[PDB]
Design a protein around this ligand. Sequence first.
Ligand SMILES: [Cl-]
Ligand SMILES: [Cl-]
Ligand SMILES: [Cl-]
Ligand SMILES: [Cl-]
Ligand SMILES: [Cl-]
Ligand SMILES: [Cl-]
Ligand SMILES: [Cl-]
Ligand SMILES: [Cl-]
Ligand SMILES: [Cl-]
Ligand SMILES: [Mg+2]
Ligand SMILES: [Mg+2]
Lengths: 205, 206
Amino acid sequence: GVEVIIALDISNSMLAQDVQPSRLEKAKRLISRLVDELDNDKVGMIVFAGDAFTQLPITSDYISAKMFLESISPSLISKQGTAIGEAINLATRSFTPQEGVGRAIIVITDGENHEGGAVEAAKAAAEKGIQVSVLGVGMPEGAPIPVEGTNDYRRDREGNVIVTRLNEGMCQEIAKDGKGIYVRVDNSNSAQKAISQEISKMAKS
Amino acid sequence: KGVEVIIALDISNSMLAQDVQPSRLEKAKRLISRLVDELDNDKVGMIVFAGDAFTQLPITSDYISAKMFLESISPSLISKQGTAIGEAINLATRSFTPQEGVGRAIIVITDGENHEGGAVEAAKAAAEKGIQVSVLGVGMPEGAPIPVEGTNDYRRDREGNVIVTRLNEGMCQEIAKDGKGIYVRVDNSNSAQKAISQEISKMAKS
Ligand SMILES: [Cl-]
Ligand SMILES: [Cl-]
Ligand SMILES: [Cl-]
Ligand SMILES: [Cl-]
Ligand SMILES: [Cl-]
Ligand SMILES: [Cl-]
Ligand SMILES: [Cl-]
Ligand SMILES: [Cl-]
Ligand SMILES: [Cl-]
Ligand SMILES: [Mg+2]
Ligand SMILES: [Mg+2]
Protein backbone atom coordinates (compact mmCIF):
# COMPACT_ATOMS: atom_id res chain seq x y z
CA GLY A 1 0.00 0.00 0.00
CA VAL A 2 1.16 3.53 -0.99
CA GLU A 3 0.24 7.18 -0.27
CA VAL A 4 -0.38 9.65 -3.11
CA ILE A 5 -0.86 13.35 -2.63
CA ILE A 6 -2.13 15.36 -5.62
CA ALA A 7 -1.09 19.05 -5.81
CA LEU A 8 -3.51 20.60 -8.25
CA ASP A 9 -3.01 24.06 -9.73
CA ILE A 10 -6.36 25.88 -9.58
CA SER A 11 -5.05 29.28 -10.73
CA ASN A 12 -7.10 31.12 -13.41
CA SER A 13 -4.87 29.85 -16.23
CA MET A 14 -6.28 26.36 -15.62
CA LEU A 15 -9.58 27.51 -17.16
CA ALA A 16 -7.89 27.71 -20.58
CA GLN A 17 -9.52 25.34 -23.06
CA ASP A 18 -6.50 24.08 -25.06
CA VAL A 19 -7.16 20.62 -23.52
CA GLN A 20 -10.86 19.58 -23.35
CA PRO A 21 -13.10 20.73 -21.78
CA SER A 22 -10.51 22.80 -19.87
CA ARG A 23 -7.12 22.22 -18.27
CA LEU A 24 -8.76 22.02 -14.84
CA GLU A 25 -11.65 19.73 -15.86
CA LYS A 26 -9.25 17.41 -17.72
CA ALA A 27 -7.11 17.33 -14.58
CA LYS A 28 -10.14 16.39 -12.44
CA ARG A 29 -11.10 13.58 -14.87
CA LEU A 30 -7.55 12.22 -14.71
CA ILE A 31 -7.48 12.35 -10.88
CA SER A 32 -10.83 10.54 -10.63
CA ARG A 33 -9.55 7.82 -12.95
CA LEU A 34 -6.23 7.75 -11.07
CA VAL A 35 -8.23 7.15 -7.86
CA ASP A 36 -10.15 4.28 -9.55
CA GLU A 37 -6.86 2.41 -10.20
CA LEU A 38 -5.76 2.62 -6.54
CA ASP A 39 -6.03 -0.55 -4.42
CA ASN A 40 -5.42 -0.48 -0.65
CA ASP A 41 -3.82 2.97 -0.78
CA LYS A 42 -4.40 6.45 0.61
CA VAL A 43 -4.87 9.66 -1.34
CA GLY A 44 -4.82 13.34 -0.36
CA MET A 45 -5.26 16.53 -2.35
CA ILE A 46 -3.77 20.02 -2.14
CA VAL A 47 -5.00 22.92 -4.29
CA PHE A 48 -2.79 25.92 -5.00
CA ALA A 49 -2.55 29.23 -6.80
CA GLY A 50 -0.83 32.10 -4.94
CA ASP A 51 -1.23 30.04 -1.73
CA ALA A 52 -1.67 26.27 -1.16
CA PHE A 53 -4.13 24.48 1.07
CA THR A 54 -5.24 20.96 1.88
CA GLN A 55 -8.43 20.25 -0.02
CA LEU A 56 -8.61 16.57 0.97
CA PRO A 57 -6.72 15.21 3.98
CA ILE A 58 -4.98 11.90 3.30
CA THR A 59 -7.65 9.16 3.28
CA SER A 60 -8.58 5.66 2.08
CA ASP A 61 -12.17 6.84 1.56
CA TYR A 62 -12.26 6.98 -2.30
CA ILE A 63 -15.98 7.77 -2.50
CA SER A 64 -15.42 10.96 -0.47
CA ALA A 65 -12.18 11.70 -2.35
CA LYS A 66 -14.15 11.89 -5.62
CA MET A 67 -16.85 14.12 -4.08
CA PHE A 68 -14.17 16.52 -2.78
CA LEU A 69 -12.51 16.43 -6.20
CA GLU A 70 -15.70 17.38 -8.06
CA SER A 71 -16.18 20.54 -5.93
CA ILE A 72 -12.76 22.08 -6.79
CA SER A 73 -12.77 25.43 -8.66
CA PRO A 74 -10.47 28.49 -8.88
CA SER A 75 -12.77 30.36 -6.46
CA LEU A 76 -11.37 28.24 -3.60
CA ILE A 77 -8.26 30.50 -3.72
CA SER A 78 -8.36 34.26 -4.31
CA LYS A 79 -4.59 34.99 -4.19
CA GLN A 80 -3.06 34.40 -7.61
CA GLY A 81 0.36 33.07 -8.64
CA THR A 82 1.80 29.59 -9.14
CA ALA A 83 3.11 28.52 -5.72
CA ILE A 84 4.31 25.01 -6.62
CA GLY A 85 7.06 25.06 -3.98
CA GLU A 86 4.53 25.82 -1.22
CA ALA A 87 2.23 23.07 -2.48
CA ILE A 88 5.06 20.51 -2.55
CA ASN A 89 6.22 21.51 0.96
CA LEU A 90 2.64 21.23 2.23
CA ALA A 91 2.27 17.79 0.64
CA THR A 92 5.47 16.44 2.24
CA ARG A 93 4.07 17.43 5.65
CA SER A 94 0.73 15.82 4.77
CA PHE A 95 1.73 12.13 4.61
CA THR A 96 1.02 9.74 7.51
CA PRO A 97 3.63 8.95 10.23
CA GLN A 98 4.02 5.37 8.99
CA GLU A 99 7.50 4.29 7.83
CA GLY A 100 8.14 1.80 4.99
CA VAL A 101 5.43 3.21 2.67
CA GLY A 102 5.87 4.38 -0.94
CA ARG A 103 4.99 8.07 -1.29
CA ALA A 104 4.22 10.13 -4.36
CA ILE A 105 3.42 13.81 -4.85
CA ILE A 106 1.73 14.44 -8.20
CA VAL A 107 1.81 18.09 -9.30
CA ILE A 108 -0.73 18.91 -11.99
CA THR A 109 -0.10 22.35 -13.45
CA ASP A 110 0.66 24.41 -16.58
CA GLY A 111 3.91 25.29 -14.73
CA GLU A 112 3.50 28.92 -15.72
CA ASN A 113 5.03 31.99 -14.09
CA HIS A 114 6.43 30.14 -11.09
CA GLU A 115 8.85 32.55 -9.40
CA GLY A 116 11.21 30.03 -7.77
CA GLY A 117 11.24 27.39 -5.06
CA ALA A 118 9.55 24.41 -6.71
CA VAL A 119 12.88 22.79 -7.67
CA GLU A 120 14.28 23.06 -4.11
CA ALA A 121 10.94 21.97 -2.61
CA ALA A 122 11.03 18.90 -4.90
CA LYS A 123 14.67 18.19 -3.90
CA ALA A 124 13.73 18.34 -0.19
CA ALA A 125 10.80 15.96 -0.79
CA ALA A 126 12.99 13.48 -2.70
CA GLU A 127 15.44 13.24 0.22
CA LYS A 128 12.53 12.22 2.49
CA GLY A 129 11.69 9.17 0.32
CA ILE A 130 8.96 10.98 -1.63
CA GLN A 131 8.81 10.94 -5.42
CA VAL A 132 7.56 14.15 -7.04
CA SER A 133 6.01 13.75 -10.51
CA VAL A 134 4.52 16.49 -12.70
CA LEU A 135 1.67 16.27 -15.17
CA GLY A 136 1.86 19.26 -17.51
CA VAL A 137 -1.54 20.43 -18.71
CA GLY A 138 -1.94 22.74 -21.68
CA MET A 139 0.08 23.43 -24.82
CA PRO A 140 3.26 25.53 -25.21
CA GLU A 141 1.70 27.50 -28.09
CA GLY A 142 -0.61 29.43 -25.69
CA ALA A 143 -4.36 29.91 -25.27
CA PRO A 144 -6.63 32.68 -23.95
CA ILE A 145 -8.80 32.12 -20.82
CA PRO A 146 -12.57 32.43 -21.27
CA VAL A 147 -14.67 34.21 -18.64
CA GLU A 148 -17.76 32.22 -17.73
CA GLY A 149 -20.46 34.87 -17.27
CA THR A 150 -19.34 37.21 -20.04
CA ASN A 151 -18.15 37.07 -23.67
CA ASP A 152 -14.69 38.32 -22.71
CA TYR A 153 -11.37 36.74 -21.76
CA ARG A 154 -9.15 37.19 -18.69
CA ARG A 155 -7.03 40.32 -18.83
CA ASP A 156 -3.76 41.34 -17.21
CA ARG A 157 -3.28 44.45 -15.04
CA GLU A 158 -2.88 46.69 -18.11
CA GLY A 159 -6.15 45.35 -19.58
CA ASN A 160 -4.74 43.06 -22.30
CA VAL A 161 -5.96 39.53 -23.13
CA ILE A 162 -3.88 36.96 -21.20
CA VAL A 163 -2.37 34.17 -23.31
CA THR A 164 -1.33 31.28 -21.03
CA ARG A 165 1.32 28.74 -22.09
CA LEU A 166 2.33 25.34 -20.75
CA ASN A 167 5.91 25.64 -19.46
CA GLU A 168 7.29 22.13 -20.00
CA GLY A 169 10.88 23.03 -19.08
CA MET A 170 9.74 24.13 -15.62
CA CYS A 171 7.62 20.97 -15.20
CA GLN A 172 10.60 18.80 -16.29
CA GLU A 173 13.09 20.38 -13.87
CA ILE A 174 10.70 19.81 -10.93
CA ALA A 175 10.11 16.14 -11.79
CA LYS A 176 13.82 15.41 -12.47
CA ASP A 177 14.94 16.79 -9.07
CA GLY A 178 11.87 15.28 -7.37
CA LYS A 179 12.90 11.85 -8.76
CA GLY A 180 9.48 11.36 -10.37
CA ILE A 181 8.32 11.40 -13.97
CA TYR A 182 7.07 14.20 -16.26
CA VAL A 183 4.24 13.69 -18.71
CA ARG A 184 2.30 16.13 -20.81
CA VAL A 185 -1.47 15.83 -20.43
CA ASP A 186 -3.36 15.97 -23.74
CA ASN A 187 -6.84 14.88 -24.87
CA SER A 188 -5.96 11.15 -24.75
CA ASN A 189 -5.75 8.88 -21.70
CA SER A 190 -1.95 8.74 -22.07
CA ALA A 191 -1.02 10.87 -19.04
CA GLN A 192 -3.38 9.03 -16.68
CA LYS A 193 -2.07 5.63 -17.82
CA ALA A 194 1.58 6.73 -17.45
CA ILE A 195 1.16 8.11 -13.90
CA SER A 196 -1.02 5.15 -12.78
CA GLN A 197 1.72 2.72 -13.86
CA GLU A 198 4.36 4.76 -11.98
CA ILE A 199 2.17 4.54 -8.83
CA SER A 200 1.74 0.75 -9.03
CA LYS A 201 5.47 0.23 -9.81
CA MET A 202 6.26 2.22 -6.67
CA ALA A 203 3.76 -0.05 -4.86
CA LYS A 204 5.79 -3.16 -5.76
CA SER A 205 9.09 -1.73 -4.50
CA LYS B 1 -37.25 61.98 -51.28
CA GLY B 2 -35.47 58.65 -51.85
CA VAL B 3 -31.80 58.15 -51.00
CA GLU B 4 -29.09 55.74 -52.13
CA VAL B 5 -27.17 53.83 -49.45
CA ILE B 6 -24.17 51.61 -50.10
CA ILE B 7 -22.83 49.48 -47.26
CA ALA B 8 -19.15 48.55 -47.35
CA LEU B 9 -18.73 45.59 -45.03
CA ASP B 10 -15.40 44.33 -43.68
CA ILE B 11 -15.34 40.53 -44.07
CA SER B 12 -11.68 39.96 -43.06
CA ASN B 13 -10.86 37.24 -40.45
CA SER B 14 -10.84 39.71 -37.57
CA MET B 15 -14.63 40.13 -38.06
CA LEU B 16 -15.08 36.59 -36.69
CA ALA B 17 -14.00 37.83 -33.25
CA GLN B 18 -16.85 37.36 -30.74
CA ASP B 19 -16.45 40.49 -28.55
CA VAL B 20 -19.80 41.63 -29.88
CA GLN B 21 -22.58 39.03 -30.11
CA PRO B 22 -22.73 36.65 -31.92
CA SER B 23 -19.61 37.95 -33.75
CA ARG B 24 -18.51 41.27 -35.26
CA LEU B 25 -19.62 40.08 -38.69
CA GLU B 26 -22.92 38.48 -37.64
CA LYS B 27 -23.84 41.54 -35.55
CA ALA B 28 -23.07 43.70 -38.60
CA LYS B 29 -25.42 41.58 -40.72
CA ARG B 30 -28.21 41.81 -38.17
CA LEU B 31 -27.75 45.60 -38.02
CA ILE B 32 -27.83 45.85 -41.84
CA SER B 33 -31.01 43.78 -42.02
CA ARG B 34 -32.68 46.23 -39.61
CA LEU B 35 -31.26 49.22 -41.50
CA VAL B 36 -32.92 47.85 -44.71
CA ASP B 37 -36.29 47.40 -42.88
CA GLU B 38 -36.23 51.15 -42.16
CA LEU B 39 -35.72 52.13 -45.82
CA ASP B 40 -38.78 53.33 -47.71
CA ASN B 41 -38.45 54.76 -51.25
CA ASP B 42 -34.73 54.04 -51.18
CA LYS B 43 -31.99 52.08 -52.89
CA VAL B 44 -29.40 49.93 -51.22
CA GLY B 45 -26.20 48.30 -52.43
CA MET B 46 -23.48 46.28 -50.72
CA ILE B 47 -19.75 45.82 -51.09
CA VAL B 48 -17.69 43.31 -49.13
CA PHE B 49 -13.96 43.83 -48.54
CA ALA B 50 -10.87 42.44 -47.01
CA GLY B 51 -7.59 42.67 -48.98
CA ASP B 52 -9.74 43.41 -52.06
CA ALA B 53 -13.27 44.84 -52.44
CA PHE B 54 -16.15 43.66 -54.60
CA THR B 55 -19.82 44.40 -55.21
CA GLN B 56 -21.99 41.92 -53.32
CA LEU B 57 -25.29 43.64 -54.12
CA PRO B 58 -25.77 46.17 -56.96
CA ILE B 59 -27.82 49.17 -55.91
CA THR B 60 -31.48 48.11 -55.78
CA SER B 61 -34.92 48.87 -54.36
CA ASP B 62 -35.48 45.09 -54.01
CA TYR B 63 -35.24 44.70 -50.20
CA ILE B 64 -36.29 41.06 -50.17
CA SER B 65 -33.31 40.16 -52.37
CA ALA B 66 -31.06 42.55 -50.42
CA LYS B 67 -31.69 40.55 -47.24
CA MET B 68 -31.03 37.19 -48.93
CA PHE B 69 -27.73 38.52 -50.41
CA LEU B 70 -26.81 39.54 -46.87
CA GLU B 71 -27.24 35.98 -45.58
CA SER B 72 -24.67 34.52 -48.00
CA ILE B 73 -21.89 36.88 -46.77
CA SER B 74 -18.88 35.23 -45.07
CA PRO B 75 -15.05 35.75 -45.03
CA SER B 76 -14.52 32.92 -47.56
CA LEU B 77 -15.95 35.24 -50.26
CA ILE B 78 -12.49 36.92 -50.29
CA SER B 79 -9.25 35.00 -49.68
CA LYS B 80 -6.76 37.92 -49.94
CA GLN B 81 -6.44 39.37 -46.44
CA GLY B 82 -6.14 43.08 -45.52
CA THR B 83 -8.36 46.02 -44.63
CA ALA B 84 -8.92 47.80 -47.96
CA ILE B 85 -11.38 50.47 -46.79
CA GLY B 86 -10.20 52.99 -49.45
CA GLU B 87 -10.77 50.56 -52.32
CA ALA B 88 -14.27 49.82 -50.92
CA ILE B 89 -15.19 53.51 -50.60
CA ASN B 90 -13.85 54.22 -54.12
CA LEU B 91 -15.86 51.28 -55.52
CA ALA B 92 -18.96 52.58 -53.69
CA THR B 93 -18.65 56.05 -55.26
CA ARG B 94 -18.63 54.43 -58.74
CA SER B 95 -21.73 52.34 -57.89
CA PHE B 96 -24.39 55.00 -57.30
CA THR B 97 -26.89 55.97 -60.00
CA PRO B 98 -25.89 58.92 -62.27
CA GLN B 99 -28.98 60.93 -61.18
CA GLU B 100 -28.13 64.34 -59.63
CA GLY B 101 -30.15 65.78 -56.69
CA VAL B 102 -30.15 62.54 -54.67
CA GLY B 103 -28.90 62.06 -51.09
CA ARG B 104 -26.20 59.40 -51.03
CA ALA B 105 -24.41 57.65 -48.18
CA ILE B 106 -21.62 55.09 -47.88
CA ILE B 107 -21.70 53.15 -44.59
CA VAL B 108 -18.43 51.43 -43.76
CA ILE B 109 -18.76 48.71 -41.13
CA THR B 110 -15.38 47.55 -39.83
CA ASP B 111 -13.00 47.15 -36.88
CA GLY B 112 -10.77 49.67 -38.81
CA GLU B 113 -7.77 47.52 -37.96
CA ASN B 114 -4.39 47.64 -39.75
CA HIS B 115 -5.54 49.79 -42.68
CA GLU B 116 -2.47 50.72 -44.80
CA GLY B 117 -3.69 54.17 -45.98
CA GLY B 118 -6.01 55.61 -48.59
CA ALA B 119 -9.32 55.44 -46.68
CA VAL B 120 -9.33 59.05 -45.48
CA GLU B 121 -8.45 60.40 -48.98
CA ALA B 122 -11.11 58.12 -50.47
CA ALA B 123 -13.70 59.43 -47.97
CA LYS B 124 -12.78 63.04 -48.69
CA ALA B 125 -13.14 62.41 -52.48
CA ALA B 126 -16.60 60.85 -51.85
CA ALA B 127 -17.56 63.89 -49.77
CA GLU B 128 -16.56 66.23 -52.64
CA LYS B 129 -19.09 64.38 -54.82
CA GLY B 130 -21.82 65.00 -52.24
CA ILE B 131 -21.65 61.47 -50.77
CA GLN B 132 -21.59 61.21 -46.96
CA VAL B 133 -19.31 58.52 -45.59
CA SER B 134 -20.22 57.09 -42.17
CA VAL B 135 -18.38 54.43 -40.14
CA LEU B 136 -19.79 51.89 -37.68
CA GLY B 137 -16.93 50.60 -35.61
CA VAL B 138 -17.39 47.04 -34.42
CA GLY B 139 -15.46 45.33 -31.64
CA MET B 140 -13.66 46.23 -28.43
CA PRO B 141 -10.67 48.64 -28.52
CA GLU B 142 -9.19 46.46 -25.70
CA GLY B 143 -8.87 43.44 -28.06
CA ALA B 144 -10.28 39.95 -28.64
CA PRO B 145 -8.98 36.61 -29.92
CA ILE B 146 -10.61 35.01 -33.00
CA PRO B 147 -12.20 31.61 -32.41
CA VAL B 148 -11.91 28.95 -35.12
CA GLU B 149 -15.24 27.41 -36.14
CA GLY B 150 -15.87 23.85 -34.89
CA THR B 151 -12.80 23.87 -32.63
CA ASN B 152 -11.76 25.23 -29.23
CA ASP B 153 -8.75 26.89 -30.90
CA TYR B 154 -8.09 30.48 -32.06
CA ARG B 155 -6.53 32.03 -35.16
CA ARG B 156 -2.75 32.15 -34.96
CA ASP B 157 -0.07 34.16 -36.73
CA ARG B 158 2.79 32.63 -38.76
CA GLU B 159 4.88 32.09 -35.62
CA GLY B 160 2.01 30.29 -33.86
CA ASN B 161 0.88 33.14 -31.60
CA VAL B 162 -2.77 33.83 -30.78
CA ILE B 163 -4.02 36.81 -32.83
CA VAL B 164 -5.70 39.57 -30.79
CA THR B 165 -7.77 42.03 -32.85
CA ARG B 166 -8.78 45.52 -31.67
CA LEU B 167 -11.28 48.06 -32.90
CA ASN B 168 -9.31 51.13 -34.05
CA GLU B 169 -11.73 53.87 -33.09
CA GLY B 170 -9.29 56.62 -34.11
CA MET B 171 -9.04 55.41 -37.71
CA CYS B 172 -12.82 54.95 -37.99
CA GLN B 173 -13.33 58.50 -36.68
CA GLU B 174 -10.92 60.15 -39.17
CA ILE B 175 -12.69 58.42 -42.07
CA ALA B 176 -16.17 59.53 -40.92
CA LYS B 177 -15.06 63.10 -40.19
CA ASP B 178 -13.47 63.71 -43.60
CA GLY B 179 -16.33 61.78 -45.21
CA LYS B 180 -18.85 64.16 -43.58
CA GLY B 181 -20.82 61.31 -41.99
CA ILE B 182 -21.03 60.00 -38.46
CA TYR B 183 -18.96 57.58 -36.41
CA VAL B 184 -20.71 55.22 -34.00
CA ARG B 185 -19.40 52.28 -32.05
CA VAL B 186 -21.39 49.11 -32.40
CA ASP B 187 -22.04 47.32 -29.08
CA ASN B 188 -24.68 44.74 -28.01
CA SER B 189 -27.62 47.18 -28.00
CA ASN B 190 -29.55 48.52 -31.01
CA SER B 191 -27.92 51.94 -30.50
CA ALA B 192 -25.69 51.93 -33.59
CA GLN B 193 -28.49 50.79 -35.92
CA LYS B 194 -30.83 53.50 -34.70
CA ALA B 195 -28.17 56.20 -34.91
CA ILE B 196 -27.35 55.32 -38.52
CA SER B 197 -31.01 54.94 -39.56
CA GLN B 198 -31.58 58.38 -38.01
CA GLU B 199 -28.71 59.81 -40.06
CA ILE B 200 -30.14 58.24 -43.23
CA SER B 201 -33.63 59.67 -42.41
CA LYS B 202 -32.11 63.12 -41.74
CA MET B 203 -30.36 63.00 -45.13
CA ALA B 204 -33.60 62.01 -46.94
CA LYS B 205 -35.52 64.90 -45.38
CA SER B 206 -32.94 67.56 -46.20
CL1 LIG C 1 -7.52 11.10 -18.27
CL1 LIG D 1 6.24 28.39 -4.10
CL1 LIG E 1 12.44 26.82 -8.71
CL1 LIG F 1 -3.23 42.53 -26.54
CL1 LIG G 1 -6.19 36.66 -39.11
CL1 LIG H 1 -28.79 46.15 -34.49
CL1 LIG I 1 -7.56 50.73 -49.37
CL1 LIG J 1 -5.86 56.75 -44.50
CL1 LIG K 1 1.27 34.91 -27.64
MG1 LIG L 1 -1.77 29.93 -13.60
MG1 LIG M 1 -9.44 42.51 -40.25
